[PDB]
Design a protein around this ligand. Structure first.
Ligand SMILES: Nc1nc2c(ncn2[C@H]2C[C@H](O)[C@@H](COP(=O)(O)OP(=O)(O)OP(=O)(O)O)O2)c(=O)[nH]1
Ligand SMILES: [Ca+2]
Ligand SMILES: [Ca+2]
Ligand SMILES: [Ca+2]
Length: 341
DNA sequence: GGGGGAAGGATTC
DNA sequence: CACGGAATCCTTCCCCC
């Protein structure tokens, strides 16, 4: 099977440039301001001219200002990036019908019935890249291989604005050279666990007894690594469906006062419903980020849909259940709706 | 012994 | 000093055949 993976370069920042080309060349950082003070918040992402100095997704906006005081700092405009993404995805949907939109800027295309041998795939790659650069003026990186995982790894090795192919032979070389940490799905928590098992390469997962790999990282992940090691990973590409909609917000100050948190929670609910489109959820979860960046949630499933009146009422009850079972102060509050009809 | 929810936590991207 | 949207997986409790 031949899988082509696409991943837009420094997406949010690159969109901000396209919309104001006068930004190209200068350091661009897209921020999410929490409003706890002037520049409280984090970096959603930044362009290469900024990333080369350490400014990247996840760090505090303040840290970023210490490093690049003169960089251009723009507030994150999610709705806009979302549309630019949709237009591109619609464009990809014309090079293949079997498409899986993994994230706001990732997509896997199954082009097995559109080509043969990696030569035409590469060409189909430059075709897509050129097309996207023409109609939306966005640069993307392409990855091509036998399955979704290897297609993604390929892209990573080819960024930025690149394209690469990992053939059935190149793959065999990766199973022994690739750090188990650079495999998708293996974050820091899992990378260290596999380290204590003497698993530094994908192939090394074949040495341990399955029963103790499972004991360390769970069955799912275990069978996952083993499959990629035996070159037996072959997950189908397919339309993924939104199964959850929600909204979280940060409060000016950490609180425990129910009447103090409510207005925030109610704002989360109001946006969540507008976002719901016209979907009827039967489950609702209240999510709170406590004072020490720890997450705690409480929810309920109903035998019928949830009107907005019911969401309001139940959310307050669920928040109360949280303050009563956790002594910590609340920093962030939000709601999540699921189990749509 | 075991299926399927539901709930709350844990990780990853 | 650190935001957010959402998917998947895990352990536990449960009701009960
Ligand atoms: N709000 C928020 N957005 C994030 C975060 N991490 C990534 N994103 C955004 C950044 C991009 O706009 C989009 C895709 O992220 P990627 O990991 O693919 O990196 P990016 O697109 O920045 O460029 P790259 O792949 O490194 O060339 O998702 C995050 O921590 N918070
Ligand atoms: Ca990207
Ligand atoms: Ca991406
Ligand atoms: Ca990693």
């Amino acid at each position: 099977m031949i899988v082509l993976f696409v991943d837009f370069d420094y997406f949010y920042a690159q969109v901000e440039e396209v919309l104001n080309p006068s930004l190209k060349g200068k350091p661009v950082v897209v921020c999410v301001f929490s409003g706890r003070f002037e520049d409280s918040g984090a970096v959603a992402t930044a362009n290469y001219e900024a990333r080369k100095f350490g400014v990247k997704a996840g760090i505090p906006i303040v840290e970023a200002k210490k490093i690049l005081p003169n960089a251009v700092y723009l507030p994150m405009r999610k709705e806009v990036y979302q549309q630019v993404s949709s237009r591109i995805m619609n464009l990809l949907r014309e090079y293949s019908e079997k498409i899986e939109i993994a994230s706001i800027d990732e997509a896997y295309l199954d082009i097995s019935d559109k080509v043969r041998d990696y030569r035409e795939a590469y060409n189909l790659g430059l075709e897509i890249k050129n097309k996207i650069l023409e109609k939306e003026k966005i640069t993307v990186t392409v990855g091509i291989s036998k399955n979704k995982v290897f297609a993604k790894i390929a892209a990573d090795m080819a960024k930025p604005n690149g394209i690469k192919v990992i053939d059935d032979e190149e793959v065999k070389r990766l199973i022994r050279e690739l750090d188990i940490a650079d495999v998708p799905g293996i974050g820091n928590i899992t990378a260290e666990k596999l380290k204590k098992l003497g698993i530094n390469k994908l192939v090394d997962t074949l040495s341990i007894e399955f029963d103790k790999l499972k004991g360390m990282i769970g069955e799912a992940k275990a069978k996952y690594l083993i499959s990629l090691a035996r070159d037996e990973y072959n997950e189908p590409i397919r339309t993924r469906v939104r199964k959850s909609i929600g909204r979280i917000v940060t409060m000016k100050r950490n609180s425990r006062n129910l009447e103090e948190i409510k207005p925030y929670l109610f704002r989360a609910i109001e946006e969540s419903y507008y976002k719901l489109d016209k979907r009827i959820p039967k489950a609702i979860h209240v999510v709170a980020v406590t004072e020490d960046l720890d997450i705690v949630s409480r929810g309920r499933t109903f035998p019928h849909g949830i009107s907005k009146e019911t969401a309001y009422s139940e959310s307050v009850k669920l928040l109360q259940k949280i303050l009563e079972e956790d002594e910590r102060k609340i920093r962030r509050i939000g709601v999540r709706f699921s189990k749509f009809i």
